[PDB]
mmCIF file of C-alpha atoms and ligand atoms in Angstrom:
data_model
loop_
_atom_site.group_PDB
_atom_site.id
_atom_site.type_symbol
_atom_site.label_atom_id
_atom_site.label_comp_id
_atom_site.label_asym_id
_atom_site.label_seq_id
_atom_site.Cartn_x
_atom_site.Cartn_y
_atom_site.Cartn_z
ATOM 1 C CA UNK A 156 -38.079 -30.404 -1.283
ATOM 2 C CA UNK A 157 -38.757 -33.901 -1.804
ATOM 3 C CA UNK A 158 -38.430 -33.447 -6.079
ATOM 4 C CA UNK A 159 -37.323 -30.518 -7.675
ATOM 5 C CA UNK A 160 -37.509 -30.247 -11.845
ATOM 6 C CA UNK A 161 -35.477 -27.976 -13.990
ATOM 7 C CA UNK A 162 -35.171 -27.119 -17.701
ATOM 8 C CA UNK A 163 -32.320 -25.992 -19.608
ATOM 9 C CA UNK A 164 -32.255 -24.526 -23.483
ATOM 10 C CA UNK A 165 -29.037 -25.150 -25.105
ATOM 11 C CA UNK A 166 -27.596 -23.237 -28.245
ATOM 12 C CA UNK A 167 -28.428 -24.049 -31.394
ATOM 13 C CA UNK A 168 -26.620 -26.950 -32.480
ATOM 14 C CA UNK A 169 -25.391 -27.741 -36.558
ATOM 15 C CA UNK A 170 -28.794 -29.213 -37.754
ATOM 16 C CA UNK A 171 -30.394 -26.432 -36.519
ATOM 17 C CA UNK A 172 -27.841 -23.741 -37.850
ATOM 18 C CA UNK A 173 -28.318 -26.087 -41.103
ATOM 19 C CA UNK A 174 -31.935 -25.344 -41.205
ATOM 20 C CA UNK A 175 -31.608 -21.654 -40.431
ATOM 21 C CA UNK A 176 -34.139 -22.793 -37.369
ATOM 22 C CA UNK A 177 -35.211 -19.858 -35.275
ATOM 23 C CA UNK A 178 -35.886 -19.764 -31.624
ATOM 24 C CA UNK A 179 -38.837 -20.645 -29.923
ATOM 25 C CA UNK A 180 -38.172 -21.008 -26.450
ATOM 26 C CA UNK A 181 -37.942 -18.213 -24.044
ATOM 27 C CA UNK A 182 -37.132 -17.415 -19.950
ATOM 28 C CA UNK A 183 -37.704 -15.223 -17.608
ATOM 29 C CA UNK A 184 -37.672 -16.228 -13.765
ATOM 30 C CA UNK A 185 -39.102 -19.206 -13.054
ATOM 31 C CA UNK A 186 -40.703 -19.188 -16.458
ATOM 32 C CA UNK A 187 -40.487 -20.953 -19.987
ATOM 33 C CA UNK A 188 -42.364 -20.181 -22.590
ATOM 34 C CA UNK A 189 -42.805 -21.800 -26.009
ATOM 35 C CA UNK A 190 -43.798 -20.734 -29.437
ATOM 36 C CA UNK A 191 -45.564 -23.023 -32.371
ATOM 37 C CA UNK A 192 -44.132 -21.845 -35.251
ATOM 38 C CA UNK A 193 -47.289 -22.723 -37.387
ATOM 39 C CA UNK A 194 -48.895 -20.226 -34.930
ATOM 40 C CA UNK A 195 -46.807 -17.631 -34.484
ATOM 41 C CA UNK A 196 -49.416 -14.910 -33.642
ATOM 42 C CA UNK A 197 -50.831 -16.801 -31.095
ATOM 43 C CA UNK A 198 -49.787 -16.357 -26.817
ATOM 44 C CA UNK A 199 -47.279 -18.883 -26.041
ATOM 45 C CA UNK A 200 -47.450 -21.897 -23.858
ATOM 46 C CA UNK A 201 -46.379 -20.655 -20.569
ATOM 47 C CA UNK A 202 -44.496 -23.693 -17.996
ATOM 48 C CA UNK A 203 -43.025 -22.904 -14.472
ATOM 49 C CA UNK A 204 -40.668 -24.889 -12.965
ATOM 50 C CA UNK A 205 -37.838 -24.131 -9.710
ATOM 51 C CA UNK A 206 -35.700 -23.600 -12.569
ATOM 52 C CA UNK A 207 -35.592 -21.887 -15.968
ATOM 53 C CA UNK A 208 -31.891 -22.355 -17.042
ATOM 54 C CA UNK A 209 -31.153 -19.850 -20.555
ATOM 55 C CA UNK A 210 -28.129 -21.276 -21.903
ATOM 56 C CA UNK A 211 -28.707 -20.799 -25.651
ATOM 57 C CA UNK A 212 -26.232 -17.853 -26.251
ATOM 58 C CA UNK A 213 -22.279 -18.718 -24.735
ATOM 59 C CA UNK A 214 -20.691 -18.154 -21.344
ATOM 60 C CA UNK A 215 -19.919 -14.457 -22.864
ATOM 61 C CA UNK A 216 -23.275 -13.389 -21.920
ATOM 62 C CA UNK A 217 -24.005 -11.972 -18.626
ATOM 63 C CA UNK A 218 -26.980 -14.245 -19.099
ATOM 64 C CA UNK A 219 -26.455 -17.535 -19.746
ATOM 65 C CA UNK A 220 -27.052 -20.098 -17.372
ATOM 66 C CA UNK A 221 -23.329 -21.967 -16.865
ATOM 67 C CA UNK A 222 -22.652 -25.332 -15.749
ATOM 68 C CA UNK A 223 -21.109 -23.623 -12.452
ATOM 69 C CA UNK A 224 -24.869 -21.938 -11.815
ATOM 70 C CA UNK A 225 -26.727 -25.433 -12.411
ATOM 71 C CA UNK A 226 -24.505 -27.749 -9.980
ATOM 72 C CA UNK A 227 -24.446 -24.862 -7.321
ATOM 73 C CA UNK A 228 -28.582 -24.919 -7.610
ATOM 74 C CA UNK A 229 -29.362 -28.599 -7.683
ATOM 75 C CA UNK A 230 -25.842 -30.795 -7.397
ATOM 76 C CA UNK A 231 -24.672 -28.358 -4.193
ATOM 77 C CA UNK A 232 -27.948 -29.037 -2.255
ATOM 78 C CA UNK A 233 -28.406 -33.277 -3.430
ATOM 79 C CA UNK A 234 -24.668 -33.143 -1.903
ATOM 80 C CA UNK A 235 -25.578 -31.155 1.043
ATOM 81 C CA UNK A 236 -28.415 -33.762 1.566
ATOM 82 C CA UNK A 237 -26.034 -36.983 1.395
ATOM 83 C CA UNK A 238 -23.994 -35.664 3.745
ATOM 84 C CA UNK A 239 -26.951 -35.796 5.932
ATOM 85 C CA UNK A 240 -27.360 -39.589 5.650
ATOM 86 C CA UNK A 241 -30.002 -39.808 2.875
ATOM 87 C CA UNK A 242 -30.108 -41.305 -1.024
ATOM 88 C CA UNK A 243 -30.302 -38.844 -3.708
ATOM 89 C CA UNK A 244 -31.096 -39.084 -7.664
ATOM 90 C CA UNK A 245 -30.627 -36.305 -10.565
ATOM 91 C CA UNK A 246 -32.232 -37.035 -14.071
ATOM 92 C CA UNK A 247 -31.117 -35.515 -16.873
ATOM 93 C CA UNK A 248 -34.259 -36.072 -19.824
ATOM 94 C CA UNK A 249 -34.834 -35.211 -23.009
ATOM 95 C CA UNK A 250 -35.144 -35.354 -26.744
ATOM 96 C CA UNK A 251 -31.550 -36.608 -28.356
ATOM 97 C CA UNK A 252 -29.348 -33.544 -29.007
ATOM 98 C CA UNK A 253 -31.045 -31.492 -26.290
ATOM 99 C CA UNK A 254 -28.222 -31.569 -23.351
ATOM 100 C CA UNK A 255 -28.478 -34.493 -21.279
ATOM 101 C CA UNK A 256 -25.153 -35.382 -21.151
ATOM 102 C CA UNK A 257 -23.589 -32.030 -21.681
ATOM 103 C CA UNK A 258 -25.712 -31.280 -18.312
ATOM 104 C CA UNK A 259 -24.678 -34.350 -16.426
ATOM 105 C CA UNK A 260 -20.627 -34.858 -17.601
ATOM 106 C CA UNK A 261 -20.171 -31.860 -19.630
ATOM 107 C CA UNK A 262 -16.876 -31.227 -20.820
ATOM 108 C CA UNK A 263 -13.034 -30.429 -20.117
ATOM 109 C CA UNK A 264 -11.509 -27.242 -21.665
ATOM 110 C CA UNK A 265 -12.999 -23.672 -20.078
ATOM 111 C CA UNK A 266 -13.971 -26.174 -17.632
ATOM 112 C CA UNK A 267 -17.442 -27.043 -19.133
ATOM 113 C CA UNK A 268 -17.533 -29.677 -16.372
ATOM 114 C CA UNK A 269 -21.428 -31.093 -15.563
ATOM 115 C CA UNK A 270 -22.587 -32.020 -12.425
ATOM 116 C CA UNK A 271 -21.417 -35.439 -11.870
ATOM 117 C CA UNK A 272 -17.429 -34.016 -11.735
ATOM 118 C CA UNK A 273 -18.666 -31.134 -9.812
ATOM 119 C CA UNK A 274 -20.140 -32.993 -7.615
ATOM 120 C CA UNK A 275 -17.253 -35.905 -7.607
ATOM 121 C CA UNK A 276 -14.548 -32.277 -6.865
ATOM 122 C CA UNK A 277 -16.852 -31.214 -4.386
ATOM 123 C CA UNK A 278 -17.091 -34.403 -2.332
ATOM 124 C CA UNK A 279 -13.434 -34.802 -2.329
ATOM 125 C CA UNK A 280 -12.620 -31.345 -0.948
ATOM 126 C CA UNK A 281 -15.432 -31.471 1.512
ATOM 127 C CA UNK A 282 -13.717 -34.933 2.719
ATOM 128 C CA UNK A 283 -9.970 -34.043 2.466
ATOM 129 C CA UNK A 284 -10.624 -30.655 4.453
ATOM 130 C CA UNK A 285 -12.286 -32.395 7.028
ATOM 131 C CA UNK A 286 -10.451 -32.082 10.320
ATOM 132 C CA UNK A 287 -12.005 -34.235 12.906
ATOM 133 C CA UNK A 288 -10.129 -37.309 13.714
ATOM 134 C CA UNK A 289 -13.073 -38.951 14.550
ATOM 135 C CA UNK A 290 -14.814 -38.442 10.938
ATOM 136 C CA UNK A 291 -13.286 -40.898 8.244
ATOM 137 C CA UNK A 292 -14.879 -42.128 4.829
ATOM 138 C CA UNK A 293 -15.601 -44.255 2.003
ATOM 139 C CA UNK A 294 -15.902 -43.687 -2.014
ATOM 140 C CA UNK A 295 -16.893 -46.447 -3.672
ATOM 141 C CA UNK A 296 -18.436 -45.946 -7.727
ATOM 142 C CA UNK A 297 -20.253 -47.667 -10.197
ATOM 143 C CA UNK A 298 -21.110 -46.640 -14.025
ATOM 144 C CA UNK A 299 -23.066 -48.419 -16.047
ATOM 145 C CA UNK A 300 -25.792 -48.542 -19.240
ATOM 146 C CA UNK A 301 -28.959 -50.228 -19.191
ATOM 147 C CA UNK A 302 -30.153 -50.927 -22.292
ATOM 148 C CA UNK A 303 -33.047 -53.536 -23.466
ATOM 149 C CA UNK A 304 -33.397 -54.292 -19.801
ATOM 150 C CA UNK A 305 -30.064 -55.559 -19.476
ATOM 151 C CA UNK A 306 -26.371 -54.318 -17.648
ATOM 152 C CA UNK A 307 -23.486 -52.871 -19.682
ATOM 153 C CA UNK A 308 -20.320 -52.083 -16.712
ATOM 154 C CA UNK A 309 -18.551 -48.934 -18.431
ATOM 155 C CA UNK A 310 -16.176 -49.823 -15.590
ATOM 156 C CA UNK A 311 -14.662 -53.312 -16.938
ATOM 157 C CA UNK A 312 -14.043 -53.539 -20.645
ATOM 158 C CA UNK A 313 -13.550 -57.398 -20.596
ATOM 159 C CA UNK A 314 -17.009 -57.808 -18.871
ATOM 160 C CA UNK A 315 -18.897 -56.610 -21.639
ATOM 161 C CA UNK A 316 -23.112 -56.202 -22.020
ATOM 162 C CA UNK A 317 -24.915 -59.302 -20.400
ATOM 163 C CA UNK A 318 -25.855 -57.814 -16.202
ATOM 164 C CA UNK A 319 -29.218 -58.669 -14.977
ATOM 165 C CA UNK A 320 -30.465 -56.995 -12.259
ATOM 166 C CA UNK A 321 -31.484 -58.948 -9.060
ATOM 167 C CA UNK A 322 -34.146 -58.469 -5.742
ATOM 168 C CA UNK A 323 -31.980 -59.577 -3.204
ATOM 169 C CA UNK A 324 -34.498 -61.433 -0.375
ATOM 170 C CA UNK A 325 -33.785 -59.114 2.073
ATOM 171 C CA UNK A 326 -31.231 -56.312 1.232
ATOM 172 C CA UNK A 327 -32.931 -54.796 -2.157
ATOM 173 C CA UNK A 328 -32.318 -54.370 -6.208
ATOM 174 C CA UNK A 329 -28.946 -54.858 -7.004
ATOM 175 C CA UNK A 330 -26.562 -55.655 -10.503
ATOM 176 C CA UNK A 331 -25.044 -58.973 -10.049
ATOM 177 C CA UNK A 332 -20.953 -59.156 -10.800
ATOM 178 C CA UNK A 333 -20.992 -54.705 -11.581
ATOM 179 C CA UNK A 334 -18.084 -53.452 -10.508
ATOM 180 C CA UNK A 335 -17.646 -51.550 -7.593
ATOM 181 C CA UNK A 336 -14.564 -49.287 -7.139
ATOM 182 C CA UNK A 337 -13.460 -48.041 -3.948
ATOM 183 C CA UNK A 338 -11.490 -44.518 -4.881
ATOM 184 C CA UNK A 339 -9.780 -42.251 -2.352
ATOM 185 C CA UNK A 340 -9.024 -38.715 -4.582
ATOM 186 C CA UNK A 341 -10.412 -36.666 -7.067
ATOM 187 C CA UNK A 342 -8.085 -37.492 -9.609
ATOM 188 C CA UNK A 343 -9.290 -41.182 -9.487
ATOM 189 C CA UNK A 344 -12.890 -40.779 -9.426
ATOM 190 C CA UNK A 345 -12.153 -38.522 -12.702
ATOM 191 C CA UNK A 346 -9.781 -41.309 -13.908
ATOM 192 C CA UNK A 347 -12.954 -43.762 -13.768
ATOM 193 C CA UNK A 348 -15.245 -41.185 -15.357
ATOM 194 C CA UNK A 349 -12.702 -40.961 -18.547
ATOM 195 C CA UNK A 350 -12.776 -44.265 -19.082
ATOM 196 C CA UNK A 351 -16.514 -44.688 -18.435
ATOM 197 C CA UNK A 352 -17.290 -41.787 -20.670
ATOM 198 C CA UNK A 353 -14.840 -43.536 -23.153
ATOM 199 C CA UNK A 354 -16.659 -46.743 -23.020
ATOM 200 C CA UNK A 355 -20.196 -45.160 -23.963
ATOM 201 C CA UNK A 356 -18.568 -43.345 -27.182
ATOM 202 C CA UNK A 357 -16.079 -45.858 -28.722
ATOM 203 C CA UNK A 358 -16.722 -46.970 -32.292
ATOM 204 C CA UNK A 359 -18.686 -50.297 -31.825
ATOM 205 C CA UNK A 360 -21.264 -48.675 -29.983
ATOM 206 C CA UNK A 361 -22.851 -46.479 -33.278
ATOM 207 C CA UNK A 362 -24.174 -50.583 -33.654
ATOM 208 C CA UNK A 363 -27.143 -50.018 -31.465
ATOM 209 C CA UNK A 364 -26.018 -46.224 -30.967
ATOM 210 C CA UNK A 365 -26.316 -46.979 -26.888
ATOM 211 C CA UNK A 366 -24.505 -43.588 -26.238
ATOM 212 C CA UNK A 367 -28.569 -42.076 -27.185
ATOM 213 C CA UNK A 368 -30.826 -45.143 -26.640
ATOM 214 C CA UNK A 369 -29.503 -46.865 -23.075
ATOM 215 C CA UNK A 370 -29.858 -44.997 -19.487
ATOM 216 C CA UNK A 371 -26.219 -44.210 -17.922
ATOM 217 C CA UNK A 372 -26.496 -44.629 -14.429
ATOM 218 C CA UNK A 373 -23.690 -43.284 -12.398
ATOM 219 C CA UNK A 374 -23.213 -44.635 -8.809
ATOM 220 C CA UNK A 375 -22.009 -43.310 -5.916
ATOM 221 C CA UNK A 376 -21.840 -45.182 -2.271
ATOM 222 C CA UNK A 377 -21.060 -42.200 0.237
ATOM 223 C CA UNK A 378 -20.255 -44.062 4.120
ATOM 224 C CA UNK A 379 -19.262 -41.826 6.602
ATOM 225 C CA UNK A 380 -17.737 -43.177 9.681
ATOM 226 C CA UNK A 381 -17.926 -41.000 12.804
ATOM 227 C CA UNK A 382 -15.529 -42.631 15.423
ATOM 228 C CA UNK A 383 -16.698 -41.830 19.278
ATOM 229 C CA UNK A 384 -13.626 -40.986 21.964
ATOM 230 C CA UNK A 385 -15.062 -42.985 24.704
ATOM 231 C CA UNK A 386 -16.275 -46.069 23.927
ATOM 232 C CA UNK A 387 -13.830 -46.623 20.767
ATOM 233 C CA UNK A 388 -16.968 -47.414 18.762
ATOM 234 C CA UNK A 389 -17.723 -46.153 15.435
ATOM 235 C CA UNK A 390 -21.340 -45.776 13.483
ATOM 236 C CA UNK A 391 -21.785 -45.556 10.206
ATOM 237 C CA UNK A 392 -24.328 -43.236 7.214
ATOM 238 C CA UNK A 393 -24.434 -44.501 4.431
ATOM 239 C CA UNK A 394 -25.814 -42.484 1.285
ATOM 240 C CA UNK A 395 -26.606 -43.591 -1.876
ATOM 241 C CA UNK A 396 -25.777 -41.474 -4.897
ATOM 242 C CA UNK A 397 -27.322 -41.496 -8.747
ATOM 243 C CA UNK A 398 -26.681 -40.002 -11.313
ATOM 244 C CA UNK A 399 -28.798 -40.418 -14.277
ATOM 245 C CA UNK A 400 -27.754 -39.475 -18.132
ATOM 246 C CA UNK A 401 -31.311 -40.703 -19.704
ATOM 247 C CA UNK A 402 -31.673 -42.484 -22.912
ATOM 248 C CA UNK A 403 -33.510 -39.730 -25.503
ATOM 249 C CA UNK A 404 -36.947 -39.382 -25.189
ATOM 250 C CA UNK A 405 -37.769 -38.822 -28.494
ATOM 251 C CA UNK A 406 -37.148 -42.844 -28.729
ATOM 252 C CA UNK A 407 -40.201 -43.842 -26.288
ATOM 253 C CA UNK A 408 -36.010 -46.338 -37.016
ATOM 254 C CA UNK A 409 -36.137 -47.601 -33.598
ATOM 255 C CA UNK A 410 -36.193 -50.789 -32.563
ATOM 256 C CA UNK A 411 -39.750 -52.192 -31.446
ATOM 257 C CA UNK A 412 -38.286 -53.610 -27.940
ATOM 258 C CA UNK A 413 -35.516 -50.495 -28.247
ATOM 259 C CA UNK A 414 -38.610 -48.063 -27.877
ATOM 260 C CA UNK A 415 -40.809 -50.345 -25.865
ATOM 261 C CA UNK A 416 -38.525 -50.278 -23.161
ATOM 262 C CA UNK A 417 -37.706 -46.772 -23.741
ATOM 263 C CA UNK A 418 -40.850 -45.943 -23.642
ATOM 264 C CA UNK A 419 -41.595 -48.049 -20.337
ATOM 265 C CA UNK A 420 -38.876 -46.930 -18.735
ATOM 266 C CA UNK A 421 -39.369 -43.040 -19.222
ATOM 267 C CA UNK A 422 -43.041 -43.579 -18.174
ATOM 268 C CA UNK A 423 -42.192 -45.443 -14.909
ATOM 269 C CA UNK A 424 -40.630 -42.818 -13.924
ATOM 270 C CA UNK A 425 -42.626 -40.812 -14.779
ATOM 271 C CA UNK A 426 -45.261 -41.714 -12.262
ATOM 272 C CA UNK A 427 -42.980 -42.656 -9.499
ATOM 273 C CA UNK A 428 -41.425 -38.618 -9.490
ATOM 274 C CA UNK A 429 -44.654 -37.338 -9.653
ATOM 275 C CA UNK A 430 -46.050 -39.584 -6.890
ATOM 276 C CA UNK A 431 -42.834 -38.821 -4.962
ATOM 277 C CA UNK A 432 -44.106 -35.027 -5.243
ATOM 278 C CA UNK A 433 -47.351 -35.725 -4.482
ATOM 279 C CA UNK A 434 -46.472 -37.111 -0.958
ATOM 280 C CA UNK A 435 -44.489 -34.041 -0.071
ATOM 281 C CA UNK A 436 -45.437 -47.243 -6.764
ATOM 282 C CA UNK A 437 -44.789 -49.546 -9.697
ATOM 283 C CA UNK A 438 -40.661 -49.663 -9.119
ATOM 284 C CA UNK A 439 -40.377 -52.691 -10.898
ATOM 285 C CA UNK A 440 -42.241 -51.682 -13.985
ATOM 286 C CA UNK A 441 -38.653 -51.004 -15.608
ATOM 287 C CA UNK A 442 -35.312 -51.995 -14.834
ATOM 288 C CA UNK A 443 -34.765 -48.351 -14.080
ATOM 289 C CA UNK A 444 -36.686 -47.769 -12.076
ATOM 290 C CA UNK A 445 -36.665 -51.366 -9.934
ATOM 291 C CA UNK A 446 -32.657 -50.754 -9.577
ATOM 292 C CA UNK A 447 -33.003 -47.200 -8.496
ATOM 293 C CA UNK A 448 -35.827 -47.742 -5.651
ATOM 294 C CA UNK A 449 -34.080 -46.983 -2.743
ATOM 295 C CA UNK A 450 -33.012 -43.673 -4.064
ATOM 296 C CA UNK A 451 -36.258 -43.177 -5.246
ATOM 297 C CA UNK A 452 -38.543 -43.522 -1.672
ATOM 298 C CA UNK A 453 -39.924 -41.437 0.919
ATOM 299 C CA UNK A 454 -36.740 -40.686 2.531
ATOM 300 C CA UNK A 455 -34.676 -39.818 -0.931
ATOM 301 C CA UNK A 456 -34.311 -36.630 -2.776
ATOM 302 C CA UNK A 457 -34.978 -36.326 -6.549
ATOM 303 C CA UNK A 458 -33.951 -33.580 -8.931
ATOM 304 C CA UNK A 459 -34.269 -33.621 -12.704
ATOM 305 C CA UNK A 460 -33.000 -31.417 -15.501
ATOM 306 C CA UNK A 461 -34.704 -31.659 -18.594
ATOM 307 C CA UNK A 462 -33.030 -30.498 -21.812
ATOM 308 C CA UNK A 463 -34.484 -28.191 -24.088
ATOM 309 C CA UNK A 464 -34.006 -27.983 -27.703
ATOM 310 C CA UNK A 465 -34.155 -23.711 -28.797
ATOM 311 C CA UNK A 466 -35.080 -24.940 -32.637
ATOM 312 C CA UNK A 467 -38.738 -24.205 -34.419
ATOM 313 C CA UNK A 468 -38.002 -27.598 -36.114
ATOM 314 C CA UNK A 469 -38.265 -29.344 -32.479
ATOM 315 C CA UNK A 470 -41.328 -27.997 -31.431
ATOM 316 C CA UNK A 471 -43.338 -31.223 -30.977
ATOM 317 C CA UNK A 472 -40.714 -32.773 -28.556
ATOM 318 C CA UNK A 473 -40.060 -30.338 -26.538
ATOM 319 C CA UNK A 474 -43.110 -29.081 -25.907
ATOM 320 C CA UNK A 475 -43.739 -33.410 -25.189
ATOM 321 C CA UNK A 476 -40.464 -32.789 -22.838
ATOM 322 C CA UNK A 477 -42.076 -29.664 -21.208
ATOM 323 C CA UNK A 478 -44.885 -31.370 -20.544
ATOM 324 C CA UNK A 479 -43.040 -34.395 -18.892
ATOM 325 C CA UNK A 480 -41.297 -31.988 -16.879
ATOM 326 C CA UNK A 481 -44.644 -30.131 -15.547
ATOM 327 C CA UNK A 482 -46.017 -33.827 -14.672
ATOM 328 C CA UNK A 483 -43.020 -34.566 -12.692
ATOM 329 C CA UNK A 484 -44.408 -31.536 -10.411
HETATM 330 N N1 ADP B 186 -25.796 -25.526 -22.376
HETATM 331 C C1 ADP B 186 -25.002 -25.868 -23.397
HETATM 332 N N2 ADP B 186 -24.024 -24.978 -23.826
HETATM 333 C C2 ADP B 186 -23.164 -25.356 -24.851
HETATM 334 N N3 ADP B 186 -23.157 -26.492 -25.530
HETATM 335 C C3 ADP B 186 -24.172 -27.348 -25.113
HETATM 336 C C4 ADP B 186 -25.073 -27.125 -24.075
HETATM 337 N N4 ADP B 186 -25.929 -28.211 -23.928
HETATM 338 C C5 ADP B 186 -25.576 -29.034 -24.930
HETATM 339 N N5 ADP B 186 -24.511 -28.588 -25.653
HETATM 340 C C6 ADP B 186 -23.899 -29.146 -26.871
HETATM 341 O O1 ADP B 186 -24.861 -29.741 -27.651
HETATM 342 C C7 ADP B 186 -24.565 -31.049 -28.109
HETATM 343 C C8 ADP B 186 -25.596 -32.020 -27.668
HETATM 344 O O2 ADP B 186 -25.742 -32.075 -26.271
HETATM 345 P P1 ADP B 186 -25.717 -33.501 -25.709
HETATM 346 O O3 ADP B 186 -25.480 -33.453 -24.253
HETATM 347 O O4 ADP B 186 -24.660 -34.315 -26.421
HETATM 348 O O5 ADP B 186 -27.142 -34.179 -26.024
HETATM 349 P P2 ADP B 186 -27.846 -35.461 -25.462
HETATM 350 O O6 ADP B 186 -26.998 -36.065 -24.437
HETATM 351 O O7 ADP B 186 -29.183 -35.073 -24.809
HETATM 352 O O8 ADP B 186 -28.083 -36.339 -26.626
HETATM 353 C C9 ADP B 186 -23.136 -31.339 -27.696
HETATM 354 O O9 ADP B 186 -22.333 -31.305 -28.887
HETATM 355 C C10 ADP B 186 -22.836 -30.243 -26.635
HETATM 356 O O10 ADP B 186 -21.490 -29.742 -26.619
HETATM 357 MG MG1 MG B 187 -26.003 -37.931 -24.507
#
């Protein structure tokens, strides 16, 4: 399908364990359902979505949605669909704390990897195994933040901040001087992530705290090169790849132009998914969205997987982030 929208409830998490919070959220199928907790006697509000992911208890449980079943759902098939020639985007929104980038990067040990490294590991081995002389390929990455409507490469340290985006004449939206690594292995593409992930967590950024207030927007540039016997000549597919770790949406203490583009941004969107699903478009209403509209047209495929807070104390945002979610639809 042209956009697909998940939701995922994580564990409860210390503030919540602080406040003894109990759980309002609850699956089945398809299904979530949410409970006010200033009406507890009433029906709950019912959402359906492709995907209801229950991952509040631990990987102990028979059911608990891991980050194995969430790639193999959404990242398997968006990775199926590059290798067909066509651009593909996964969101990951939601309130601060929910899961965003527990969903997207996850983490090491008992292999909590998200979808971006199972999707990098899965590209690799699809590649490496390949075993037609005629089929060779191409890597090349980008990470960066956007925050206030400007660039931050989590790829060059030096750099540092400052990229505008730019409309080339003819060839589209592009970041002028980002870096763009060609990588041939796994082990590479996971060497960049490190240090990316690095970058968005060191101790100067709890200044503007951009790890929870910019957009991370991973990049991958997929060209296949299928060589022909006769002839000697070789065309090419191209696929665009992104990524998205979104900045909280509780933030649409904040900054007025922090949460005005926020706020923007998140909405753009917004409209352009649900458009996008209403075929099967103001791009340059945020930076966001203007850089991502190529994987974001008729021909692309969209997923997003919105975080869920389980807590009684979050009720207001994530019923506002269920909500978003059922829009996107
Ligand atoms: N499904 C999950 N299972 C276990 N831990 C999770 C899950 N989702 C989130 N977490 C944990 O919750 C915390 C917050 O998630 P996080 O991704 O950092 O939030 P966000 O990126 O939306 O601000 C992290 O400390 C993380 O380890
Ligand atoms: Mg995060």
């Amino acid at each position: 399908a042209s956009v697909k929208v998940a939701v995922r409830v994580r564990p409860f998490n210390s503030r919540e364990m602080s406040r003894d919070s109990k759980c309002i959220i609850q699956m089945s199928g398809s299904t979530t359902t949410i409970v006010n907790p200033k009406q507890p006697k009433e029906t709950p509000k019912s959402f359906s979505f492709d995907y209801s992911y229950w991952s509040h208890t631990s990987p102990e449980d028979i059911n608990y949605a891991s980050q194995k079943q969430v790639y193999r759902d959404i990242g398997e098939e968006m990775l199926q669909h590059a290798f067909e020639g066509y651009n593909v985007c996964i969101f990951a929104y939601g309130q601060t704390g929910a899961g965003k980038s527990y969903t997207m990067m996850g983490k090491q040990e008992k292999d909590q990897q998200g979808i971006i490294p199972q999707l990098c590991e899965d590209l690799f081995s699809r590649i490496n195994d390949t075993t037609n002389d005629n089929m060779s390929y191409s890597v090349e990455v980008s990470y960066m933040e956007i925050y206030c409507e400007r660039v931050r490469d989590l790829l060059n340290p030096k750099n540092k901040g400052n990229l505008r985006v730019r409309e080339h004449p003819l060839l589209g939206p592009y970041v002028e001087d980002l870096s763009k690594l060609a990588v041939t292995s796994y082990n590479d593409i996971q060497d960049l992530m490190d240090s990316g992930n690095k970058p968005r967590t060191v101790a100067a950024t709890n200044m503007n705290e951009t790890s929870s207030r910019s957009h991370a927007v991973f990049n991958i540039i997929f060209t296949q090169k299928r060589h022909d016997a006769e002839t000697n000549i070789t065309t090419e597919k191209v696929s665009k790849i992104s990524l998205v770790d979104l900045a909280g949406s509780e933030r649409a203490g904040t900054r007025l132009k922090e949460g005005a583009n926020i706020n923007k941004s998140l909405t753009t969107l917004g409209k352009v998914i649900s458009a996008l699903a209403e075929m099967d478009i103001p791009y340059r209403d945020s930076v966001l969205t203007w850089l991502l509209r190529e994987n974001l047209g008729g021909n692309s495929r969209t997923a997003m997987v919105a975080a869920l807070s389980p807590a009684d104390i979050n009720y207001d945002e994530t019923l506002s982030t269920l909500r978003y979610a059922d829009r996107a639809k």
